Amino acid sequence: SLTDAVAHLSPERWEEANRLLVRKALAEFAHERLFTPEPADGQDGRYVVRSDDGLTSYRFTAVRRALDHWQVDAGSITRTRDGAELPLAALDFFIELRHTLGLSDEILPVYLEEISSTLSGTCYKLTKPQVTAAGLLEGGFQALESGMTEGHPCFVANNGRLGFGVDEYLAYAPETAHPVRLVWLAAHRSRAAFTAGAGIDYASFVRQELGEETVERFDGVLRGRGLDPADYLLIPVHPWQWWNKLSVTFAAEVARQNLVCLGESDDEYLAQQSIRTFFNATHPEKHYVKTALSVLNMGFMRGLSAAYMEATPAINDWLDRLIDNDPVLKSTGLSIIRERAAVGYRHLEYEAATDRYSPYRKMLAALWRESPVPALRDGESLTTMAALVHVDHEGRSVAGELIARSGLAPTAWLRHYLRAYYTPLLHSFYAYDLAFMPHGENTILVLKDGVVQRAVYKDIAEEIVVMDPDAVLPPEVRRVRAEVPEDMKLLSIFTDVFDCFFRFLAAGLATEEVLAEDDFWRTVAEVTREYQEAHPELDDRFRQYDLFAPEFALSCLNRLQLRDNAALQLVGTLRNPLAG
Amino acid sequence: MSLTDAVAHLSPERWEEANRLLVRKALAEFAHERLFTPEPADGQDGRYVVRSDDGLTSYRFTAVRRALDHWQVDAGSITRTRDGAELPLAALDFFIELRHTLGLSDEILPVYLEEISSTLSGTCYKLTKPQVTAAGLLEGGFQALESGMTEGHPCFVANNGRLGFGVDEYLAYAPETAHPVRLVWLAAHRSRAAFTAGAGIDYASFVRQELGEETVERFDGVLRGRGLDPADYLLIPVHPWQWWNKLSVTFAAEVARQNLVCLGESDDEYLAQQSIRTFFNATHPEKHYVKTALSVLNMGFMRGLSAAYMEATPAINDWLDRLIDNDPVLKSTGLSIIRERAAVGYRHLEYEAATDRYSPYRKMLAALWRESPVPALRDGESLTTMAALVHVDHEGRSVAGELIARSGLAPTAWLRHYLRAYYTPLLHSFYAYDLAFMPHGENTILVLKDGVVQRAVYKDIAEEIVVMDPDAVLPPEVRRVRAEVPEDMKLLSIFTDVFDCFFRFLAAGLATEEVLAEDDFWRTVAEVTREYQEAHPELDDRFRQYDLFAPEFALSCLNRLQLRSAALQLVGTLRNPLAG
């Protein structure tokens, strides 16, 4: 068990994880123009990137694809210096390119720690049983969720689990798919508040989610300690949060019975890609639970804002009603899974000692989100949209397998997906000034017979932006308006959809010899023209925000992460694949 | 480990008592360091008041004032009032109400509060423990006294933070819980780890003496099973908390490349001493203590153990040991140290590259073995940490007080014997060798026979020993100990570290106990000082140069440091009790 825990850390797996990461650093740091890979007169596509001092040479072959994409080949990479080849080590790579990459003295050590954790997790993932794209689909919703291996396709340091010890990682990382029980707390009402959504009320919500039997048992616990149950609320907490933060950092709250530990949940939960959010494995119909988890990101503590909980359910109600009343959206089948209830806790002493940004204000909250399962009709299947870019050990993406099992010509397949996922983004932008953060982890696709029926969006309250400062919204919702410069409004599509998802989906489907790049992008223009066709009432906005402009700005995600703490790092422009 | 069991020490009652004791200390110690100057309220006897930053809230208390500007604040009397009504005595609200007065910046206050919560949690645990009397502790023995200490450092208010431990890990590892611990043993590659030996120490046999042949050959077997050669490896013992939370995640590159391989648990059971990182061997008290790298948090920063300083430590010890042997004044006093006999350090080369020498990533893996004080014990002799002299019963009897009773000597005679054992060597070190220690209660062990102190034992030499002569000739590894100390500050080594940071508490406690008047305490110290000085005219010049009998000396404030002879915080002066 001492050794069992650390068994995934082996030389052979470490070496593979390091090669795979250096492959992604080369491919992604190039795209963001941190370094410009020189050609070498060898093949028509052999390149070299050198270290700060010029002595170490990383040599690789790469296929250059649309949107400045670099399909670097992992087996080709070589680290050479003074004539002799060296081991490919992600840690040495970032050191030797310390200055080239903009890694400052202050941040490089913590960045190497996030890098080591990401490599650890690849190593764990490399010990799981090998499963094919077909295999993941036969497994189902959570097979896909916990079978994702890449993570966010832009960030090189993307799957850190810093703050988990090795035993805590094995117990809580989504890639391990271990069941987890939440810890239930009673929070005293002088410091905790419960906000309900449309048609939710606390009394019955808690009954339908815990069981009359458990609520009684909990209410009994409180009476045993001389506390009136009517003075408290239930908060679910992540066990790591309880044992490591709440019981120590919030001991003043425990000791004064502002917080009372009621015990574990009887249901078993499974961590999603988000880490902090749990799917109810025992009863998939029940709500997801999003918890507060103070793990580390670049040495800064994460968490869940309690101040934001008061307005999350209302914002969701607003977006849900918005979607139900718009026929362009209803026709696409678009749905959100709403945050239906939330509860936030104010540690008043920490509050007086901090500003509205402290992670101490973010250490205890929770919200519940509708499960997507009960909507499913006969023969319909769920998948994280992230799977479309997931690749087999055999080289087959789940997108590729889906296209295959569907029997459709790839273009017809792509067009159903674009119509369910990409059309609503267009309509949100032009008709409501609405924008999202719609990447693979925030989107779920409903599947029938291998073809994408419709899309579900999750976690909208946190990310949603109405780009109209004067917009006329209900009161609890006006906090989502923002003043976005004109030349930047359209990067919600250009950056978040095209440059951060499609660029990989298109590049992966071409190297898979399934769909050529030019067809993919031609489909994306066709769907765009299909939408704008239908709405000449917006032709002025279609011109004012030209989805067919020849260039747009290059927005570099890894550069955002290396600067640390609209602050975007734009560096020149990209040739728009949609230009004709 | 039940969820509810683990937080059971956190009760409303214990929390209340815990807060009254800490505000008492904070009022007493911040008055000493003149962070506030208590005004006499109600013009009544010795009742004082200290008000919040705005004048609206009053902390009222009564205090006996004693030598060295000492405030014995009465915990039972403290009171917090606004608009006529009493308010709960809350340590956190205290530090927030006095934010501006104590200099708690907006940057440090949130984490200072967290440290206060930790110290309060620890007191709550101690309040949970069976009450033991001063006689009861001496009957328990060496380790009974170690884990029976409750105060911690007498000066620092926020003094027993255990930040980094989750509540389960606090119960497992904190010295005040006296729970047995097994060390984790690692094999480390000699490309990256150095074992450095003190005089007469050999690695192969040292390892054998400490672990046993059977286990060394089992560990060698683990290495062999992985295709490795034991000849390329050292053993390092690591704190379990360090292995599970730091080494197996942060040093993942090292475990995966098998520069570090995990061997198992120690068969011996260990007990954490007051420093938390250092373990007494409960199974075999005659064996070595182990001191470990343990990267917990003090004030937001990660503690640790420098590997760099490991190769010097056995040398510095040997040096001081021979010095003590080669000197007839010291030998007259029975003084010894428990040498650090071996050390081992690990250089993580990528982190080293990426950091300066102060980064905590260098102080994450290292260990040293320390001689046990037990086998040198003669018949009828016992051990106690000097911190126990200022430890006070739940009945008001200090251990110092009980020893004075048990001895049947006059309080002055008892003190004189302690002073010769402990204080006289410091004098000779300062004046004959210009050699200053850090001899606080936690770094000194006393040897007892018949309730009279026989001799002192110094530990933690290399970490704190300072030679006040930059030109002193010393063996090469020992030269790093030399420093330049201003002349006016050289003597604060005694005035500050001994007089104001220990004797102040001992003299005051003994006087309140009605065991020994302060004037008699200080007269005894003066007597002992001339007894030493008169028997050494060869050093008359220095005695006049560094006048121990000056009228006054600088007030050096320890708490003022924790909120910020290098940059100490000198604030005014103190009437030297030796002014006779």
CSV table of C-alpha atoms in Angstrom, one decimal, chain A residues 227-569:
chain,number,residue,atom,x,y,z
A,227,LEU,CA,-29.3,22.3,18.7
A,228,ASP,CA,-32.6,23.2,17.0
A,229,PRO,CA,-32.7,21.6,13.5
A,230,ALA,CA,-34.8,24.6,12.4
A,231,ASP,CA,-31.7,26.8,12.9
A,232,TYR,CA,-29.5,24.9,10.4
A,233,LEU,CA,-29.1,24.0,6.7
A,234,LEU,CA,-27.5,21.0,5.0
A,235,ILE,CA,-24.3,21.7,3.0
A,236,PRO,CA,-22.6,18.8,1.2
A,237,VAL,CA,-18.8,19.1,1.3
A,238,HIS,CA,-16.0,17.3,-0.5
A,239,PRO,CA,-14.2,15.0,2.0
A,240,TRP,CA,-10.8,16.5,1.1
A,241,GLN,CA,-12.2,19.9,1.9
A,242,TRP,CA,-13.5,18.7,5.3
A,243,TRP,CA,-10.5,16.8,6.5
A,244,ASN,CA,-7.9,19.3,5.3
A,245,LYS,CA,-9.5,22.8,5.2
A,246,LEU,CA,-12.9,23.0,7.1
A,247,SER,CA,-11.9,21.1,10.2
A,248,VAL,CA,-8.6,23.1,10.6
A,249,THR,CA,-9.0,26.5,8.9
A,250,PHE,CA,-12.7,26.7,10.0
A,251,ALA,CA,-12.2,25.1,13.4
A,252,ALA,CA,-13.7,28.2,15.0
A,253,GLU,CA,-16.9,27.4,13.1
A,254,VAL,CA,-16.9,23.7,14.1
A,255,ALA,CA,-16.0,24.5,17.7
A,256,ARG,CA,-18.9,27.0,18.1
A,257,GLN,CA,-21.4,24.7,16.4
A,258,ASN,CA,-21.9,27.1,13.5
A,259,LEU,CA,-20.9,23.9,11.7
A,260,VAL,CA,-21.8,20.4,12.7
A,261,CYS,CA,-20.5,17.3,11.0
A,262,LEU,CA,-23.4,14.9,10.3
A,263,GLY,CA,-21.6,12.1,8.6
A,264,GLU,CA,-21.2,10.5,5.2
A,265,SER,CA,-23.8,10.2,2.4
A,266,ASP,CA,-25.3,6.9,1.6
A,267,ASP,CA,-25.2,7.6,-2.1
A,268,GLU,CA,-21.9,7.1,-3.9
A,269,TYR,CA,-20.6,9.9,-6.2
A,270,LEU,CA,-18.0,10.0,-9.0
A,271,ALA,CA,-15.8,13.1,-9.7
A,272,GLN,CA,-16.3,14.7,-13.1
A,273,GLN,CA,-13.5,16.2,-15.2
A,274,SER,CA,-14.1,19.4,-13.1
A,275,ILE,CA,-12.8,17.4,-10.0
A,276,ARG,CA,-15.0,19.6,-7.7
A,277,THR,CA,-18.3,18.4,-9.1
A,278,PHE,CA,-19.8,14.9,-8.4
A,279,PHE,CA,-22.2,12.7,-10.4
A,280,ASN,CA,-24.5,10.5,-8.4
A,281,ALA,CA,-23.5,7.0,-9.4
A,282,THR,CA,-26.0,5.2,-7.1
A,283,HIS,CA,-28.9,7.2,-8.5
A,284,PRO,CA,-28.0,9.0,-11.8
A,285,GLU,CA,-31.4,10.7,-11.8
A,286,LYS,CA,-30.4,12.8,-8.7
A,287,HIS,CA,-28.6,16.1,-8.8
A,288,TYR,CA,-24.9,16.6,-9.4
A,289,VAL,CA,-23.1,18.2,-6.4
A,290,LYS,CA,-20.6,21.0,-7.0
A,291,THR,CA,-18.5,21.4,-3.9
A,292,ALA,CA,-15.8,23.8,-2.8
A,293,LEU,CA,-12.4,22.4,-3.2
A,294,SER,CA,-9.4,24.5,-2.2
A,295,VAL,CA,-6.8,22.5,-4.2
A,296,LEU,CA,-4.0,24.4,-5.9
A,297,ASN,CA,-3.6,26.1,-9.3
A,298,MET,CA,-0.1,27.6,-9.8
A,299,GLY,CA,0.2,27.7,-6.0
A,300,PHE,CA,-3.0,29.7,-5.6
A,301,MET,CA,-6.1,28.2,-3.9
A,302,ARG,CA,-9.2,27.5,-5.9
A,303,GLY,CA,-12.7,27.3,-4.4
A,304,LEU,CA,-16.4,28.2,-4.9
A,305,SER,CA,-17.6,31.7,-4.2
A,306,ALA,CA,-20.2,31.9,-1.6
A,307,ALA,CA,-21.1,35.5,-2.6
A,308,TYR,CA,-22.0,34.1,-6.1
A,309,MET,CA,-24.4,31.4,-4.8
A,310,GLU,CA,-27.2,33.9,-4.1
A,311,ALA,CA,-27.6,34.5,-7.8
A,312,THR,CA,-26.6,31.3,-9.5
A,313,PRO,CA,-30.1,29.6,-9.6
A,314,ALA,CA,-31.8,32.8,-10.8
A,315,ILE,CA,-29.3,33.3,-13.7
A,316,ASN,CA,-30.0,29.7,-14.7
A,317,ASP,CA,-33.8,30.2,-14.5
A,318,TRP,CA,-33.3,33.3,-16.8
A,319,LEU,CA,-31.3,31.4,-19.3
A,320,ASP,CA,-33.6,28.4,-19.3
A,321,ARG,CA,-36.7,30.6,-19.9
A,322,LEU,CA,-34.7,32.4,-22.5
A,323,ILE,CA,-34.1,29.2,-24.4
A,324,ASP,CA,-37.7,28.0,-24.0
A,325,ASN,CA,-39.1,31.2,-25.5
A,326,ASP,CA,-36.8,31.4,-28.5
A,327,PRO,CA,-37.9,29.2,-31.5
A,328,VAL,CA,-34.4,29.3,-33.1
A,329,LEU,CA,-33.0,27.8,-29.9
A,330,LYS,CA,-35.9,25.4,-29.4
A,331,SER,CA,-35.5,24.1,-32.9
A,332,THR,CA,-31.9,23.1,-32.2
A,333,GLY,CA,-32.9,21.2,-29.1
A,334,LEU,CA,-30.5,23.2,-26.9
A,335,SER,CA,-30.9,22.7,-23.2
A,336,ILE,CA,-29.0,23.6,-20.1
A,337,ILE,CA,-28.8,21.5,-17.0
A,338,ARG,CA,-29.7,24.1,-14.4
A,339,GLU,CA,-28.1,24.8,-11.1
A,340,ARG,CA,-31.4,24.4,-9.1
A,341,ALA,CA,-30.3,25.1,-5.6
A,342,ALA,CA,-27.3,26.5,-3.9
A,343,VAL,CA,-26.0,27.2,-0.4
A,344,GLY,CA,-23.2,29.5,0.6
A,345,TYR,CA,-21.4,30.1,3.9
A,346,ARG,CA,-19.9,33.4,5.3
A,347,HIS,CA,-17.0,33.0,7.7
A,348,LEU,CA,-17.5,36.4,9.3
A,349,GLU,CA,-14.1,36.7,11.0
A,350,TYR,CA,-12.2,35.7,7.8
A,351,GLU,CA,-14.6,38.0,5.9
A,352,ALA,CA,-13.6,41.1,7.9
A,353,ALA,CA,-9.9,40.3,7.4
A,354,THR,CA,-10.0,39.8,3.6
A,355,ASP,CA,-11.2,41.5,0.4
A,356,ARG,CA,-13.8,40.2,-2.0
A,357,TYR,CA,-11.1,38.0,-3.7
A,358,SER,CA,-9.7,36.0,-0.9
A,359,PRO,CA,-9.8,32.2,-1.2
A,360,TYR,CA,-10.9,32.3,2.4
A,361,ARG,CA,-14.2,33.6,1.2
A,362,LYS,CA,-14.4,30.7,-1.2
A,363,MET,CA,-13.9,27.7,1.2
A,364,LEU,CA,-17.5,26.6,1.9
A,365,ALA,CA,-20.3,26.5,-0.7
A,366,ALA,CA,-22.2,24.0,-2.7
A,367,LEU,CA,-24.8,23.9,-5.5
A,368,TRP,CA,-26.9,21.2,-7.0
A,369,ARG,CA,-27.3,20.8,-10.8
A,370,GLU,CA,-30.0,18.9,-12.7
A,371,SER,CA,-28.9,15.5,-14.0
A,372,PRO,CA,-29.0,15.1,-17.8
A,373,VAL,CA,-30.1,11.5,-17.6
A,374,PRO,CA,-34.0,11.8,-17.0
A,375,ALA,CA,-34.4,13.7,-20.2
A,376,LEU,CA,-32.9,10.9,-22.3
A,377,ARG,CA,-35.4,9.3,-24.7
A,378,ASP,CA,-35.3,5.7,-25.9
A,379,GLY,CA,-31.9,4.8,-27.4
A,380,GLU,CA,-30.2,8.1,-26.5
A,381,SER,CA,-26.7,8.3,-25.0
A,382,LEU,CA,-24.6,10.9,-23.3
A,383,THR,CA,-21.0,12.0,-23.7
A,384,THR,CA,-18.8,14.8,-22.6
A,385,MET,CA,-18.1,16.8,-25.8
A,386,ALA,CA,-14.4,16.5,-24.8
A,387,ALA,CA,-14.6,12.9,-26.2
A,388,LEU,CA,-14.7,14.1,-29.8
A,389,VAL,CA,-11.0,15.0,-29.5
A,390,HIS,CA,-10.1,11.9,-27.5
A,391,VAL,CA,-7.9,9.4,-29.4
A,392,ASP,CA,-7.6,5.6,-29.0
A,393,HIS,CA,-4.5,3.6,-28.4
A,394,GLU,CA,-5.3,2.4,-31.9
A,395,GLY,CA,-5.5,6.0,-33.3
A,396,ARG,CA,-9.3,6.2,-33.6
A,397,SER,CA,-11.0,9.2,-32.1
A,398,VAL,CA,-14.5,8.8,-30.5
A,399,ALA,CA,-15.6,11.3,-33.2
A,400,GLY,CA,-14.2,8.9,-35.8
A,401,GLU,CA,-15.8,5.9,-34.2
A,402,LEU,CA,-19.1,7.7,-34.0
A,403,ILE,CA,-19.0,8.7,-37.7
A,404,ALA,CA,-18.2,5.1,-38.5
A,405,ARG,CA,-21.0,3.6,-36.4
A,406,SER,CA,-23.5,6.1,-37.8
A,407,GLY,CA,-23.1,5.2,-41.5
A,408,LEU,CA,-23.3,8.9,-42.5
A,409,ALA,CA,-20.9,10.6,-44.8
A,410,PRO,CA,-18.5,12.5,-42.5
A,411,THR,CA,-19.8,15.9,-43.7
A,412,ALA,CA,-23.4,14.9,-42.9
A,413,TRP,CA,-22.3,13.8,-39.4
A,414,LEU,CA,-20.4,17.0,-38.7
A,415,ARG,CA,-23.4,19.0,-39.8
A,416,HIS,CA,-25.7,17.4,-37.2
A,417,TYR,CA,-23.1,18.2,-34.5
A,418,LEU,CA,-22.5,21.8,-35.7
A,419,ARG,CA,-26.3,22.2,-35.8
A,420,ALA,CA,-26.7,21.1,-32.2
A,421,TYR,CA,-23.7,22.7,-30.6
A,422,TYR,CA,-22.5,25.5,-32.9
A,423,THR,CA,-25.8,27.1,-34.1
A,424,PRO,CA,-27.0,28.1,-30.6
A,425,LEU,CA,-23.6,29.9,-30.0
A,426,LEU,CA,-24.3,31.9,-33.2
A,427,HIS,CA,-27.8,32.8,-32.2
A,428,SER,CA,-26.8,33.7,-28.7
A,429,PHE,CA,-24.2,36.0,-30.0
A,430,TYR,CA,-26.1,37.9,-32.7
A,431,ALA,CA,-29.6,37.9,-31.2
A,432,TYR,CA,-28.8,38.4,-27.5
A,433,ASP,CA,-25.2,39.5,-27.2
A,434,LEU,CA,-24.8,36.4,-25.0
A,435,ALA,CA,-21.5,34.5,-25.0
A,436,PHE,CA,-20.4,31.3,-23.1
A,437,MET,CA,-17.3,29.4,-22.3
A,438,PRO,CA,-18.3,26.4,-24.3
A,439,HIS,CA,-15.3,24.0,-24.4
A,440,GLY,CA,-15.3,20.2,-24.2
A,441,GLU,CA,-15.7,19.9,-20.5
A,442,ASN,CA,-18.7,22.4,-20.3
A,443,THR,CA,-20.8,20.7,-23.0
A,444,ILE,CA,-22.6,17.3,-23.2
A,445,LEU,CA,-23.9,15.8,-26.4
A,446,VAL,CA,-26.9,13.5,-26.6
A,447,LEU,CA,-26.4,10.7,-29.1
A,448,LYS,CA,-28.7,8.4,-31.0
A,449,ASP,CA,-27.4,5.8,-33.5
A,450,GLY,CA,-24.1,7.5,-33.4
A,451,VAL,CA,-25.3,10.9,-34.5
A,452,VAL,CA,-25.4,14.1,-32.3
A,453,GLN,CA,-29.1,14.9,-31.5
A,454,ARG,CA,-28.6,18.0,-29.4
A,455,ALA,CA,-26.3,19.7,-27.0
A,456,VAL,CA,-26.5,20.3,-23.2
A,457,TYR,CA,-24.6,23.2,-21.7
A,458,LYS,CA,-23.5,23.1,-18.1
A,459,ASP,CA,-21.9,25.6,-15.6
A,460,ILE,CA,-23.4,28.7,-17.2
A,461,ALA,CA,-23.7,31.0,-14.2
A,462,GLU,CA,-19.9,31.1,-13.7
A,463,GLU,CA,-18.9,31.8,-17.3
A,464,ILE,CA,-21.8,33.6,-19.0
A,465,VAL,CA,-21.4,37.1,-20.4
A,466,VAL,CA,-24.0,39.5,-21.9
A,467,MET,CA,-22.0,41.9,-24.0
A,468,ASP,CA,-24.3,44.9,-23.7
A,469,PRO,CA,-23.7,47.1,-20.6
A,470,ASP,CA,-27.2,48.7,-20.9
A,471,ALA,CA,-29.0,45.4,-21.4
A,472,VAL,CA,-32.4,45.1,-19.8
A,473,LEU,CA,-32.3,41.9,-17.6
A,474,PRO,CA,-34.0,40.9,-14.4
A,475,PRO,CA,-32.4,42.4,-11.3
A,476,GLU,CA,-30.5,39.3,-9.9
A,477,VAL,CA,-29.0,38.8,-13.3
A,478,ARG,CA,-27.6,42.2,-14.1
A,479,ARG,CA,-24.2,41.2,-12.7
A,480,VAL,CA,-23.4,39.3,-15.9
A,481,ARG,CA,-23.3,42.3,-18.2
A,482,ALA,CA,-19.9,43.6,-19.3
A,483,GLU,CA,-18.3,46.3,-21.5
A,484,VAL,CA,-16.4,44.3,-24.1
A,485,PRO,CA,-14.5,46.3,-26.8
A,486,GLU,CA,-15.9,46.1,-30.2
A,487,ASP,CA,-13.0,44.4,-32.0
A,488,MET,CA,-13.0,41.7,-29.2
A,489,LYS,CA,-16.7,40.7,-28.9
A,490,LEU,CA,-16.4,38.0,-31.6
A,491,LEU,CA,-13.5,36.2,-30.0
A,492,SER,CA,-16.0,34.2,-28.0
A,493,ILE,CA,-16.5,32.4,-31.3
A,494,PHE,CA,-13.0,32.9,-32.9
A,495,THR,CA,-11.0,31.9,-29.8
A,496,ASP,CA,-13.2,29.7,-27.7
A,497,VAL,CA,-14.8,27.6,-30.4
A,498,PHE,CA,-12.5,27.8,-33.5
A,499,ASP,CA,-9.0,28.2,-32.1
A,500,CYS,CA,-9.5,26.1,-29.0
A,501,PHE,CA,-11.7,23.2,-30.1
A,502,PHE,CA,-12.4,23.0,-33.8
A,503,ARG,CA,-8.7,23.5,-34.6
A,504,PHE,CA,-8.1,20.1,-32.8
A,505,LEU,CA,-11.3,18.4,-34.0
A,506,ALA,CA,-10.4,19.3,-37.6
A,507,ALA,CA,-6.8,18.5,-37.3
A,508,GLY,CA,-7.5,15.1,-35.6
A,509,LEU,CA,-10.1,14.1,-38.2
A,510,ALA,CA,-7.7,14.8,-41.0
A,511,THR,CA,-4.7,12.8,-39.7
A,512,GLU,CA,-7.3,10.1,-38.9
A,513,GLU,CA,-8.0,10.0,-42.7
A,514,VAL,CA,-11.7,10.5,-42.1
A,515,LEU,CA,-12.5,14.1,-43.1
A,516,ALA,CA,-10.2,16.5,-44.9
A,517,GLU,CA,-9.6,19.9,-43.3
A,518,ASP,CA,-11.1,21.9,-46.1
A,519,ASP,CA,-14.3,19.9,-46.0
A,520,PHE,CA,-14.6,20.4,-42.2
A,521,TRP,CA,-14.2,24.1,-42.4
A,522,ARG,CA,-16.4,24.3,-45.4
A,523,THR,CA,-19.1,22.6,-43.3
A,524,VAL,CA,-18.5,25.2,-40.6
A,525,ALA,CA,-19.0,28.0,-43.1
A,526,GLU,CA,-22.1,26.2,-44.5
A,527,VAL,CA,-23.8,26.0,-41.1
A,528,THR,CA,-22.9,29.6,-40.5
A,529,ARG,CA,-24.4,30.7,-43.8
A,530,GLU,CA,-27.4,28.4,-43.0
A,531,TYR,CA,-28.1,30.4,-39.8
A,532,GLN,CA,-27.5,33.9,-41.1
A,533,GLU,CA,-29.7,33.0,-44.2
A,534,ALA,CA,-32.6,32.6,-41.9
A,535,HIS,CA,-32.3,36.0,-40.1
A,536,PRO,CA,-31.9,39.0,-42.4
A,537,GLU,CA,-33.2,41.0,-39.5
A,538,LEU,CA,-29.7,40.8,-38.2
A,539,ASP,CA,-27.7,41.4,-41.4
A,540,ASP,CA,-26.3,44.6,-39.8
A,541,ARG,CA,-24.8,42.7,-36.9
A,542,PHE,CA,-23.7,39.9,-39.3
A,543,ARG,CA,-21.7,42.7,-41.1
A,544,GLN,CA,-20.6,44.4,-37.9
A,545,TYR,CA,-19.1,41.2,-36.5
A,546,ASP,CA,-17.8,39.5,-39.6
A,547,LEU,CA,-17.4,35.7,-39.1
A,548,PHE,CA,-15.8,35.7,-42.6
A,549,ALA,CA,-13.2,38.3,-42.0
A,550,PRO,CA,-9.8,37.3,-43.4
A,551,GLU,CA,-8.0,37.4,-40.1
A,552,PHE,CA,-8.7,37.5,-36.4
A,553,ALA,CA,-6.5,37.9,-33.3
A,554,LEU,CA,-4.4,35.1,-32.0
A,555,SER,CA,-5.3,34.7,-28.3
A,556,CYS,CA,-2.7,32.7,-26.5
A,557,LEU,CA,-3.9,30.5,-23.6
A,558,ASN,CA,-0.6,29.3,-22.3
A,559,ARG,CA,0.7,32.8,-22.3
A,560,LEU,CA,-2.1,33.7,-19.9
A,561,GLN,CA,-1.0,30.9,-17.6
A,562,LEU,CA,2.7,31.8,-17.5
A,563,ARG,CA,2.1,35.6,-16.7
A,564,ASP,CA,0.0,34.6,-13.6
A,565,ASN,CA,-1.1,37.1,-10.9
A,566,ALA,CA,-10.0,41.3,-20.8
A,567,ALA,CA,-6.3,40.8,-19.8
A,568,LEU,CA,-5.7,38.5,-22.8
A,569,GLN,CA,-2.3,38.0,-24.5
